[PDB]
Amino acid sequence: PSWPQILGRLTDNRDLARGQAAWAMDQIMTGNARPAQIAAFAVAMTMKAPTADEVGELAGVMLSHAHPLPADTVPDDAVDVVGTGGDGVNTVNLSTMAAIVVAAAGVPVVKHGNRAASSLSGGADTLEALGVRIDLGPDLVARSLAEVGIGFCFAPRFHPSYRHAAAVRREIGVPTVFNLLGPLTNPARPRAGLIGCAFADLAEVMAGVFAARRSSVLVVHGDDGLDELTTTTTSTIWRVAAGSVDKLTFDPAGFGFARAQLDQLAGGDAQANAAAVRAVLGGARGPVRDAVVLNAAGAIVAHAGLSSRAEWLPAWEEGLRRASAAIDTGAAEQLLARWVRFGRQI
Ligand SMILES: COc1cccc2c1cc(C(=O)O)c1c(C(=O)O)cc3c(c12)OCO3
Ligand SMILES: COc1cccc2c1cc(C(=O)O)c1c(C(=O)O)cc3c(c12)OCO3
Ligand SMILES: O=P(O)(O)OC[C@H]1O[C@H](OP(=O)(O)OP(=O)(O)O)[C@H](O)[C@@H]1O
Ligand SMILES: [Mg+2]
Numbered sequence: 001p002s003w004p005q006i007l008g009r010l011t012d013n014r015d016l017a018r019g020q021a022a023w024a025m026d027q028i029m030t031g032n033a034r035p036a037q038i039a040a041f042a043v044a045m046t047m048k049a050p051t052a053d054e055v056g057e058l059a060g061v062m063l064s065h066a067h068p069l070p071a072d073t074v075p076d077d078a079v080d081v082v083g084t085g086g087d088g089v090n091t092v093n094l095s096t097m098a099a100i101v102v103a104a105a106g107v108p109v110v111k112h113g114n115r116a117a118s119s120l121s122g123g124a125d126t127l128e129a130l131g132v133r134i135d136l137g138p139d140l141v142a143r144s145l146a147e148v149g150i151g152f153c154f155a156p157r158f159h160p161s162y163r164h165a166a167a168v169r170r171e172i173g174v175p176t177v178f179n180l181l182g183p184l185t186n187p188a189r190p191r192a193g194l195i196g197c198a199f200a201d202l203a204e205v206m207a208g209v210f211a212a213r214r215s216s217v218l219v220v221h222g223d224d225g226l227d228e229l230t231t232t233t234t235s236t237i238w239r240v241a242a243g244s245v246d247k248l249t250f251d252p253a254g255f256g257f258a259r260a261q262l263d264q265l266a267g268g269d270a271q272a273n274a275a276a277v278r279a280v281l282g283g284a285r286g287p288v289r290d291a292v293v294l295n296a297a298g299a300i301v302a303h304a305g306l307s308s309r310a311e312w313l314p315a316w317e318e319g320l321r322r323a324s325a326a327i328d329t330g331a332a333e334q335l336l337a338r339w340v341r342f343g344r345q346i
């Protein structure tokens, strides 16, 4: 296999042969690819229309190189709440806030995350500003998960070999298939997730990757563009269970949610977004709480889907009760405090 062969096949608008995407990602991850080759590959794959098989190969290589968590430290029902980013909206950190709430409801959360790429403050940035340790290695993440109920896998800590691809990703500015890989490469490999995708035309492919792994995942794209379940309008959900993908449209109005405006969800710097987390966890009502509860509920629905018995509407009703209760009882607020204390005590 070679760069001219793979790039030629992609530029000819052909799906790659089995193993080719994997070979390429492996070249990229082993420092053997020129930035020009990485960029050509990312761009060519994106414009060809990536297949689930191809993206799966990419994510598989990354996982094969990632730092794993210690044996038997991640429960079978752990969940992730993470998105591609790239929605261009600069919101409050909805996935991060939802993840705290989900963990406080008693669902084990191992969240994959990163700093901002285009937004003013990404999940990792806001967590850091809240006093949460984002730098923990495999052993200490496993401990955070066991002791606090949530661990955060900072992508750079667990995927050091991806630095070459990351550089190119940042240099070229344009979203590509690489923008899908974060949510697909949680090194703890949780089997459930609420997974945001900013790119409507790539969400189905993301869902196919999770389907191949037999994860229970809702891949979500707000019809306003959010890489989250939105409250401003409907969201498209690619529902993954039992190895197949179902496309659904989701309407919060069905659950008594009032329509919000996008600017009601707007974010600021790390300090402002940290303040927004504190506000929601302290019981402040309004648009941000609503979107947090909705997304927390969706992650709980993904978790419910790990069972073959799971029913969609009962799961949403239970997810919503559980997310609201986790905030209202103070569990979410306390969990954050305990998470901060945990990190200060290593
Ligand atoms: C130094 O910057 C980094 C170090 C290690 C990893 C990553 C990284 C940057 C990005 C990124 O550019 O956002 C990134 C992304 C992404 O969303 O592109 C996805 C990933 C990553 C990384 O590893 C897991 O899957
Ligand atoms: C928590 O409840 C769930 C979580 C995740 C997925 C599903 C789900 C429930 C149902 C369901 O309505 O029994 C469901 C159905 C269905 O049987 O209509 C079909 C699917 C699904 C799901 O994902 C792939 O295609
Ligand atoms: O700068 P952007 O490309 O727009 O990305 C914004 C954040 O979105 C993704 O994280 P994540 O979904 O984990 O959560 P946060 O905003 O939602 O809570 C990404 O890793 C960034 O941290
Ligand atoms: Mg998000």
Ligand SMILES: [Mg+2]
Pocket (backbone or CB within 6 Å): 083, 085, 087, 091, 094, 095, 196, 226, 227, 228
């Ligand atoms: Mg977002």
